Every structure is written in structure tokens, then in C-alpha cells.
Symmetry: C3
Subunit: 63 residues, 3 copies
Amino acid sequence: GIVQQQNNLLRAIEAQQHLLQLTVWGIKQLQARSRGGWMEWDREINNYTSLIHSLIEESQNLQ
Amino acid sequence: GIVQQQNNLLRAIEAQQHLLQLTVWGIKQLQARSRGGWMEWDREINNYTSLIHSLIEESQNLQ
Amino acid sequence: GIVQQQNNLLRAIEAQQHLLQLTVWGIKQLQARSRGGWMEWDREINNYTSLIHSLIEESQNLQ
């Protein structure tokens, strides 16, 4: 049903957010090994991560 | 409602696309510092990015 | 319609999964060039990738 398909879409989105955070973590480990000017990059990652987190928790409450 | 949940799912997808582009940018900065054979990788990233962009703009028009 | 918007959301999710796998591949190529302790990272990437894959194939069957 429409409701079931919707819950599955959210679950996929939550699963991809996990993968996305794993790639962010990985990239940071790589940079650390060495641009030094990652300040803005970090800010953007943090802002969008917080954003995604709030949209997800919202969708979870909309289920 | 079904309509509200749907708009929120799209918003999460748009937010994750932003994060995804940030990780792509980051990876490129890392490679640049140094496989040289990233030609295909770049092509694939570009094709899927353009693809995702068109699906999003489409969903936005389907709202 | 609700059904069309839903199919488009899934398509965007499938397209982003492709991009996500491309960034994972890229990160691995970068690490390979050099933390050595990526064991857990690999396990997590694999578990969530398999997970995302099953949710997608499921959604495809829910269409």
C-alpha cells in the first residue's frame, strides 16, 4: 500500500544516511593523514547532517 | 498526511544529495593531492549527479 | 499522483545509491594508496550496502 511503500522509502533514506556518514568519516580519516582548509567543508557537512537528521526524525513522527 | 510525508521524503533526499556532493568534492580534493585514472569515475559521478538532479527537479514539479 | 511521486522518490533513491557506491569505491582507492585498520569500516559499509539493497528491491516489489 501507499503507507507501506512510504515507510520503506524512509527506511532506505535512513540506511543511506548511515552509509553517507560512513563515507564522511572515512574522508576525514584520509584528510587527517595529510588541505588544512577544510573549515568550511566541515561546517557544511555538519549543517546538512543536522538538517537531514531533523527531516528524518520528522518523517518518523509523520509515519 | 500522505502528501506531507511525501514532501518530507523529497526534502530529505535533496538534503542527502547536498551531503553526497560534499563527499564527492572532498574525494576529488584528496585525489588531486596525489590514481590518475579517474576518467571513468568522473564520468559516472557526473552522469548520476545529472540524473539525480533531473529526478529531483521532476519530483519538485510533481509536488 | 501519489503513485507517480512515489515511483520517482524510489528512482532518486536508487540513483543516489549509485553515487554513494561510487564514493565508497573512490575512498577505498584512496586508502589503498596508503590507516590499515579499516576492517570495521568495511564491515559497516558492507552491512549497510546489503541493507539498502534489500530495502530497494523490496520497494521495487511494492511498486
